[PDB]
Structure formats: C-alpha cells, structure tokens
Amino acid sequence: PFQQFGRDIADTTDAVRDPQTLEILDITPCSFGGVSVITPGTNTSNQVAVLYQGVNCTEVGSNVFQTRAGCLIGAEYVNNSYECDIPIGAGICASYQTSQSIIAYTMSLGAENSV
Amino acid sequence: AYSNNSIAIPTNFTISVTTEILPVSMTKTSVDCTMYICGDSTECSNLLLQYGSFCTQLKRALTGIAVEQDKNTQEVFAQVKQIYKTPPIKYFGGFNFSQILPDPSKPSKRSPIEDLLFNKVTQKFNGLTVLPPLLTDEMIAQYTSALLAGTITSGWTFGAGPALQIPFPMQMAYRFNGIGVTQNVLYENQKLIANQFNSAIGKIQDSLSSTPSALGKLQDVVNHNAQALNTLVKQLSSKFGAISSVLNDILSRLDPPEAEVQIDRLITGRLQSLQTYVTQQLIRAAEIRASANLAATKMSECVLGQSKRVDFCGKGYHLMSFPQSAPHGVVFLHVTYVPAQEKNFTTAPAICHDGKAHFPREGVFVSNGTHWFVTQRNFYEPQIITTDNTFVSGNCDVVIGIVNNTVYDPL
Amino acid sequence: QKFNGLTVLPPLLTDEMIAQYTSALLAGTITSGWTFGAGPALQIPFPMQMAYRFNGIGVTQNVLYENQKLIANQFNSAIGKIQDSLSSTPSALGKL
Amino acid sequence: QYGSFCTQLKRALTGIAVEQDKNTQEVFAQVKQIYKTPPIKYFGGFNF
Amino acid sequence: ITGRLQSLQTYVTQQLIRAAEIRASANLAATKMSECVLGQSKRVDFCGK
Numbered sequence: 001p002f003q004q005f006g007r008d009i010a011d012t013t014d015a016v017r018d019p020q021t022l023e024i025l026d027i028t029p030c031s032f033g034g035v036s037v038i039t040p041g042t043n044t045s046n047q048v049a050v051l052y053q054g055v056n057c058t059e060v061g062s063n064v065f066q067t068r069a070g071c072l073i074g075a076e077y078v079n080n081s082y083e084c085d086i087p088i089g090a091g092i093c094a095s096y097q098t099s100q101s102i103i104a105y106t107m108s109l110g111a112e113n114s115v
Numbered sequence: 116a117y118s119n120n121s122i123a124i125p126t127n128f129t130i131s132v133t134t135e136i137l138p139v140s141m142t143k144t145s146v147d148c149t150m151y152i153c154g155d156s157t158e159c160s161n162l163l164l165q166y167g168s169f170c171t172q173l174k175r176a177l178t179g180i181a182v183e184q185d186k187n188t189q190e191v192f193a194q195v196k197q198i199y200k201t202p203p204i205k206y207f208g209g210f211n212f213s214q215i216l217p218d219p220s221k222p223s224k225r226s227p228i229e230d231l232l233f234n235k236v237t238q239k240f241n242g243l244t245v246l247p248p249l250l251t252d253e254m255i256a257q258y259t260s261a262l263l264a265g266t267i268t269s270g271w272t273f274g275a276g277p278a279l280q281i282p283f284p285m286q287m288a289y290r291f292n293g294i295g296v297t298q299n300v301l302y303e304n305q306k307l308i309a310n311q312f313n314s315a316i317g318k319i320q321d322s323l324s325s326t327p328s329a330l331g332k333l334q335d336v337v338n339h340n341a342q343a344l345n346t347l348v349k350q351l352s353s354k355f356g357a358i359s360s361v362l363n364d365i366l367s368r369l370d371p372p373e374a375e376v377q378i379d380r381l382i383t384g385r386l387q388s389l390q391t392y393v394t395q396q397l398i399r400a401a402e403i404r405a406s407a408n409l410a411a412t413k414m415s416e417c418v419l420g421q422s423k424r425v426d427f428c429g430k431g432y433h434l435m436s437f438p439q440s441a442p443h444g445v446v447f448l449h450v451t452y453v454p455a456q457e458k459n460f461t462t463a464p465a466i467c468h469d470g471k472a473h474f475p476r477e478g479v480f481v482s483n484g485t486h487w488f489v490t491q492r493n494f495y496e497p498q499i500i501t502t503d504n505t506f507v508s509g510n511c512d513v514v515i516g517i518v519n520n521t522v523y524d525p526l
Numbered sequence: 527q528k529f530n531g532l533t534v535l536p537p538l539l540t541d542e543m544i545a546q547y548t549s550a551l552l553a554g555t556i557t558s559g560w561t562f563g564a565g566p567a568l569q570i571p572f573p574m575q576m577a578y579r580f581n582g583i584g585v586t587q588n589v590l591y592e593n594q595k596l597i598a599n600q601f602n603s604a605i606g607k608i609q610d611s612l613s614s615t616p617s618a619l620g621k622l
Numbered sequence: 623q624y625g626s627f628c629t630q631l632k633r634a635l636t637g638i639a640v641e642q643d644k645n646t647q648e649v650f651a652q653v654k655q656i657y658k659t660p661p662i663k664y665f666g667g668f669n670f
Numbered sequence: 671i672t673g674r675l676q677s678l679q680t681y682v683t684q685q686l687i688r689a690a691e692i693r694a695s696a697n698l699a700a701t702k703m704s705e706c707v708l709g710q711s712k713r714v715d716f717c718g719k
C-alpha cells in the first residue's frame with residue numbers, strides 16, 4: 001500500500017504507480033538496436049537486404065520476414081537449405097540466387113550419408 | 116620393489132571412461148555509444164561528435180570478437196563433411212551406445228548426457244544487446260551425432276578420407292593392437308569388455324548429475340559475462356565527480372557554461388568504462404580462443420583417430436573418444452585401457468642356447484621359478500619359446516644377465 | 527609490505543613440496559618406466575626399460591645389450607657436462 | 623562515491639593469484655603417490 | 671584520485687597480459703611433462719634434439 005515505484009536488479013525503474021488512480025504499470029524501453037545491410041558483390045548486383053537487429057517487425061523491398069535475430073526486409077524465405085555464404089544469425093543465411101533476388105534460408109550441414 | 120631380475124606384468128584390465136569439459140565460445144555482445152553514454156541527448160550527441168572517434172574502435176573490436184566467437188564453434192564441430200546416420204538395427208556387438216546416441220522419442224534429438232548437461236547449466240536500457248549465435252543448438256547436436264555415427268560405423272576412416280564400414284569388434288581389435296595388446300585378448304574377452312564399457316557409461320552418467328561442480332568452467336564463463344554486464348550497468352549510475360548522475364538534472368538546473376564541463380566529465384567517465392570493458396572482453400576472448408583451439412585439436416586427435424600421446428585423450432592408454440555438446444562448450448568422453456592386477460616374475464635379457472644368444476621378438480622373457488616363457492608386455496600370455504618368437508644376434512658372452520635354456524625348433 | 531599497500535602473497539605449494547613431487551616423478555620413471563602414468567606402477571629393470579626405449583626409436587634391443595657399458599659411460603659424462611654447463615653460463619636462467 | 627573500480631581491481635588480482643596457484647598445481651602433481659627409490663642405488667651402471 | 675586509478679588500471683592490465691603468457695607457458699610445461707617424462711614421445715624436436 002505505501003510503495004510507489006519499482007526497481008529491478010540493475011537499479012532501473014521497472015514499474016511505476018500513477019499518483020491518481022490505484023493502478024501499477026510497467027516501464028519498458030521502446031525498441032532500439034542496430035541495422036545491417038546484406039548485399040552481394042557490387043559488381044554481381046545492386047539489390048540490398050536490410051536486417052534490423054532484435055526488433056519485432058511491427059515496430060519497424062516489400063518483403064518482411066521475422067527472423068530470430070531480427071526483422072529482415074528485402075529478402076524472401078525459401079523452403080530449402082544450402083551451404084550458406086552470408087551468415088545472418090540463429091541458423092538463417094542469405095544468398096543471391098534465382099529473376100534474381102536475395103533469399104533467406106536455413107543452413108544445410110551437408111549431404112546425408114548412411115554407411 | 117626394484118630388482119635386477121624382477122618384472123611385473125598385468126594379468127587383467129579395467130576399461131575406464133572419463134569426462135573432460137572445455138569451453139568453446141562466449142556470448143556475443145554489442146554496445147551503442149549514444150544510447151549508453153548519455154541516452155539520446157542532443158547536447159551529448161553534439162559534444163561527442165567532436166570528441167574523438169573512439170566509438171568506431173569500440174564497435175570494430177566488438178564485431179571482431181563476435182566474428183571470432185562464431186568461428187570458434189565453426190572450427191570445432193564442423194570437422195566432418197557429411198551427416199552420417201546410424202543403421203536402424205543398433206547392435207554394435209554388445210555395446211550400449213544408447214546414452215550417447217540421440218533419442219528419437221524426445222522432441223529434440225539430443226542425447227541423455229547432453230540433456231543432463233543442458234539441464235544442469237541453463238535489450239538493456241543502456242544500449243547493451245546480446246547477438247544470437249549463427250549455429251543453433253540443434254545444428255551442434257546434429258554435428259555431434261554425425262561425428263558419433265562416423266566413429267561408430269567407420270572408425271577413423273571417415274577422417275582420413277571416404278567412410279569405410281567395419282564391424283565394431285574389429286575396430287576395437289585394431290585399437291587394442293594400437294595400444295600394444297594383441298587382438299586375441301579382445302576376441303576371447305568380448306563380453307567382459309562390453310559389460311565394463313556399459314557399466315562405465317552408466318557410472319559417468321550418474322556422476323555428471325551427482326556432482327554439480329563438473330560444469331565449473333562454463334558456469335564461470337557465464338558468470339563472468341553476467342558480472343561484466345552488471346558492473347557496467349551499475350557503474351553507469353555514478354557521480355564521476357559531478358553534481359548529479361542523472362543528466363536531466365544538470366541540463367535542466369544549470370546554464371550551459373558549466374553544464375558543458377559536467378557533461379564532458381560524464382563523457383570521459385563513460386568512455387573509460389567502455390574502454391575497460393572491451394579490454395577485459397578482448398583478454399577473455401583470447402583465453403576462449405586458446406581453449407577452443409585446444410578443444411578442436413583434442414577432437415581431431417582423439418575422436419577422428421587414436422592418439423599415442425600420453426595423458427592427452429584421457430588417463431591411460433587411449434582407445435576411443437566420444438564428443439558431446441554442452442552450453443558454450445564441448446564434453447569429451449574418453450575411453451581408456453588400464454591394467455588391473457599385477458603379478459611379478461623373474462626376467463632375463465636373453466637366453467643362451469648352443470652358444471647362440473636369443474632375444475625376444477616383441478615380448479619379454481618370464482619365469483615362474485621352473486620354466487621360462489615369452490609374453491607381451493601389457494598382458495600375461497605365456498608362450499613356449501621357439502625360433503619364431505625369438506631372434507638370434509651376437510654371441511653369448513657379451514650379454515649381462517643371460518640365462519641358459521632350451522629353445523624349441525618347429526622343424 | 528610496501529608503504530603503498532602492496533603485499534606479496536605466499537604460494538600454496540612450498541619449495542619442499544615441489545621438490546618432493548619432482549623426486550616422486552624421478553623415482554617412478556626410474557623404477558617403473560612409463561607404467562606409473564598409465565596405471566599401477568610395475569617394476570622393471572632399467573636396462574630392459576632402455577631396451578624398450580631403443581625399440582621405440584627404431585634401433586633393436588641387441589644394440590643396447592651388447593653396448594651397455596658405453597651407453598652408461600656416455601650418460602654419466604653427459605650428466606656431468608650439463609651440470610658443469612648450468613654453472614658455466616649464467617644466461618640459461620634468462621626466462622625466470 | 624567515486625565509482626566501484628576497486629572491486630574489479632581486487633577481483634582481477636585474486637583471480638590472477640588463483641590461476642598462479644593452479645599453474646604449479648597442474649604441472650608437478652601429475653603423480654598420485656610419492657614413490658621412493660630403493661636403498662641400493664645400482665640402476666645397471668647409470669649414475670643418477 | 672584519477673591519476674592513481676589510471677595507474678592501477680594500467681598495472682592490472684599488464685598483469686593480466688603477463689598472467690596469460692605465464693598460463694600459456696605453464697600449459698606447455700605440463701604437456702611436455704606428460705609426453706616426455708610419463709612416456710616416450712614420437713614427436714620431432716619436442717622433447718629434445
């Protein structure tokens with residue numbers, strides 16, 4: 001009844017009670033982070049793909065894909081698995097392959113062989 | 116007990132399995148200056164824009180550390196070229212690899228040892244972010260399973276070149292010939308060795324859960340990372356020789372003439388904190404890279420092949436090694452060969468017969484008090500001394516300690 | 527203890543303990559060979575151990591058994607020479 | 623009121639001391655028992 | 671205060687680097703002990719010339 005503020009292990013305000021009504025609400029910082037650009041060689045092509053690290057796609061090419069690393073804009077997901085050259089993060093890789101566009105896909109460990 | 120004519124040769128052996136845990140990678144992190152040092156204040160941005168170019172070095176060092184950490188796990192688990200799979204019929208000559216092989220019943224294809232290890236060891240306001248690893252848990256598990264399948268089905272052949280199938284008892288016989296004991300020992304004592312292997316696997320499975328201190332290296336790594344992050348966050352909220360820690364109070368209380376000095380002091384303090392953080396991170400990254408190189412070398416010389424190095428792939432004579440995934444590390448299961456029961460005898464360097472000195476060919480002469488036999492060094496297998504077990508060289512007078520006995524001629 | 531708060535802590539293992547460990551290792555390698563590292567210590571005469579080492583390097587056991595005295599004399603001379611050398615040149619301890 | 627560096631200083635120094643203690647521990651203690659030579663030191667003509 | 675804190679930080683940074691070098695040397699010494707004293711080594715130029 002007498003407490004008004006809230007504070008986490010790192011001494012940062014977590015929840016604050018508004019002085020007028022008897023309600024308590026959390027305080028979460030609105031989304032921030034870094035941005036990255038995925039492109040092949042500039043001689044190979046000119047298209048680029050932009051990855052927003054650690055932000056949901058709601059906060060943010062017309063293609064939008066939700067990766068565990070972040071939001072990927074400008075690349076499309078494929079139901080395949082290739083030996084990837086551009087590591088995006090969390091098992092997802094991108095490459096420039098066919099009429100031609102950047103494609104995001106899960107890594108392939110290798111050919112499956114049963115001795 | 117040392118004597119001029121006394122030698123102790125084992126008569127039995129015990130198969131022992133040991134565990135070694137080695138760190139491989141540490142958590143990837145990034146720092147944003149503007150969000151950390153002041154937190155999107157226009158005055159701080161304007162001042163720091165003209166205050167050096169440290170942030171470029173900070174970001175470059177952090178990115179290099181993250182790339183190196185990604186490479187660390189890449190160079191340890193991806194030593195195989197293909198994803199080998201075990202045959203559906205899991206007999207393996209009486210050996211129970213269930214505790215190390217993946218369990219299809221569990222939703223995640225992870226071995227019971229890996230499950231126990233993972234059960235034991237399980238965006239900040241200031242601009243601290245933790246990047247995800249490129250290789251997920253399932254990918255490392257698949258790599259470990261492929262390595263296990265290769266070493267079970269083909270032996271060491273899948274590392275030198277194409278995978279060549281071989282029955283597991285024959286592979287164990289080859290390992291025994293590698294350590295010095297002959298193949299007969301294994302073929303006659305197959306069931307006992309299988310039982311010892313299963314018992315050792317069960318015992319290490321129980322031990323990994325009995326003592327929680329086995330995962331100390333990985334626990335220390337994660338604790339160090341958490342301590343560094345928490346120390347940075349706590350140290351941000353410090354006076355640093357200023358009127359107040361919160362920049363809002365300075366910017367709303369006093370005029371620019373001394374607010375500039377206050378914010379400059381805060382800038383210096385936070386820059387020093389970031390520099391210390393990245394220096395410690397670089398030192399820790401160097402240590403982790405050394406550990407990862409050691410782990411990769413151990414994988415190469417113990418899992419992909421038998422090692423003659425002493426005390427490298429276990430305690431004793433090395434036979435096999437099985438890798439297991441772990442949070443920010445790898446666990447090695449080392450199977451070793453240890454003599455058990457020692458019996459001493461009387462030995463002589465050579466035998467004098469018809470003025471001809473006979474020397475043992477890959478063996479040692481052994482006497483029980485009334486007759487002399489020849490046997491291997493690491494196991495007691497007496498044999499009648501003949502002209503094929505021994506070779507003749509030199510005369511009888513030169514050797515010191517030579518004894519007289521009769522050698523049988525097959526012809 | 528320096529005036530500025532500098533203190534040097536003593537090592538957990540003393541000189542005598544390290545000397546005892548070294549002596550134990552020497553006794554093991556002299557009496558048993560390499561057996562005390564793999565498992566239980568197994569006694570073996572030193573000439574037989576040297577013959578095993580010779581077979582390890584490629585030369586046959588005959589070479590040692592026929593030339594035992596010469597090898598013993600060479601070993602003693604080498605030990606004496608290194609003992610003299612460790613005192614002749616003070617630069618050997620440069621790392622420490 | 624001036625930061626908390628001294629905790630990091632002391633922790634780093636203590637970790638260094640612990641590692642230095644471990645260094646000598648992992649080099650000389652590879653044997654499990656304290657073997658002793660026999661009283662008669664012949665050793666086949668070798669002078670140890 | 672700032673001067674002495676900087677001096678202490680430099681001292682412990684150099685001490686950490688030297689400790690890393692000494693740890694590498696100690697690991698090498700332990701490996702040499704294991705592969706030369708506890709057993710014969712087939713590695714070339716590792717346990718002598």
Ligand SMILES: *[C@@H]1O[C@H](CO)[C@@H](O)[C@H](O)[C@H]1NC(C)=O
Pocket residue numbers: 019020021022
């Ligand atoms: C303030 O006024 C509001 C009007 O709805 C009332 O609900 C609230 O209880 C008042 N403040 C207090 C005493 O909590």
Ligand SMILES: *[C@@H]1O[C@H](CO)[C@@H](O)[C@H](O)[C@H]1NC(C)=O
Pocket residue numbers: 043044
């Ligand atoms: C791009 O690739 C083409 C063909 O491979 C090559 O001729 C060209 O030199 C490359 N660009 C650069 C900047 O090297």
Ligand SMILES: *[C@@H]1O[C@H](CO)[C@@H](O)[C@H](O)[C@H]1NC(C)=O
Pocket residue numbers: 078079
């Ligand atoms: C590709 O995978 C997604 C993921 O569930 C799925 O929704 C989609 O149908 C797949 N594509 C095809 C052609 O089936």
Ligand SMILES: *[C@@H]1O[C@H](CO)[C@@H](O)[C@H](O)[C@H]1NC(C)=O
Pocket residue numbers: 116121459460461
């Ligand atoms: C074996 O060693 C024991 C003491 O350890 C000794 O009494 C015995 O005589 C030895 N055996 C032979 C055959 O000399």
